[PDB]
Design a protein around this nucleic acid. Structure first.
Length: 226
DNA sequence: AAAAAAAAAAAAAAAAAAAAAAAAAAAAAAAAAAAAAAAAAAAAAAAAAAA
DNA sequence: TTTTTTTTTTTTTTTTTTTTTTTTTTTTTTTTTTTTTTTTTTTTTTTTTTT
């Protein structure tokens, strides 16, 4: 039906607003993102619900609550990583595209603040690694949907690319950061040539030391940058 | 004796028209939510008048 | 100069109306069947005409 859908989603919104730290939050987010493309009215309501639940300007005070929301989003994505990313990406298309006009640009500021604050969290991380790779993966998705949001920090992302370990999650770091570089390098405003030099050098160094899929997904980036 | 060609009514046959019916879809109505607009009211500000 | 009084603007609340959405019900044009009538065509005998 179309009634029942609206009613159950209303109940879910009240649940996720009122008494957080309930266990089943993540799954609720997974199901609601699963239903983003089904209809029209449902689409409008989920769009406005997600615009008020996460992507709000979040003024620069009480940063701990903001970090807790960040924890929420990272948990959601890291749990839905198994099935697929298509619904999330479609949702992101909807939220970004749906405001092409000036219209005070409410979301652009907030999203850029989410990515830079995640960068900063990554910075102070310094050394749970599942959460690290999940955050980098979230960075990857946010780059894929729109590349302008992650233009400034790629040179700061370079040191992770240089050396890493022989564990799976680390390999996921290597492939995802290569993917990000592939996505962002052509749009980077006036890069430095030595930066490209060391990029290409360690890319070859990575090729000569690791498995199949990582070699594939990095020589891809090599072809793109060349 | 012979013979050919043309008409007229009656008979068939296929296409179109006229009842008869069945089913999808447009319409209407009710409820109820969500929104929008208008009226009013409360507070803030800026000017004007007197001591 | 300062104190006291007036007026305009801004913003929030509320109430009535409007819009929306679904759902259920209804009644209508649409679609198919059957018939069946008409009209055209056909035939065959009759009539007309020719040798």
């Amino acid at each position: 039906g179309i009634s029942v859908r609206k009613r159950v989603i209303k109940i879910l919104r009240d649940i996720c607003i009122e008494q957080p730290t309930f266990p089943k939050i993540t799954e609720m987010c997974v199901k609601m993102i699963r239903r983003v493309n089904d209809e029209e009215g449902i689409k409008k309501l989920v769009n406005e619900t997600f615009q008020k639940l996460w992507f709000t300007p979040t003024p620069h005070n009480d940063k701990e609550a903001m970090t807790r929301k960040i924890l929420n989003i990272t948990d959601v994505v890291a749990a839905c990583r198994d099935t697929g990313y298509d619904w999330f990406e479609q949702l992101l298309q909807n939220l970004l595209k749906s405001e092409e006009d000036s219209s005070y640009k409410p979301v652009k500021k907030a999203c850029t603040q989410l990515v830079d604050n995640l960068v900063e969290h990554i910075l102070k991380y310094e050394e749970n690694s599942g959460r690290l790779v999940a955050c980098i993966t979230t960075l990857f998705l946010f780059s894929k949907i729109r590349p302008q949001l992650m233009v400034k920090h790629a040179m700061t992302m370079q040191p992770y690319l240089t050396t890493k370990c022989s564990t799976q999650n680390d390999f996921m770091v290597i492939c995802n950061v290569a993917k990000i570089l592939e996505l962002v390098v052509p749009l980077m405003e006036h890069p430095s040539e030595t930066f490209l030099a060391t990029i290409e050098e360690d890319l070859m160094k990575l090729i000569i030391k690791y498995g199949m899929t990582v070699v594939q997904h990095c020589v891809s980036c090599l072809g793109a940058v060349v």
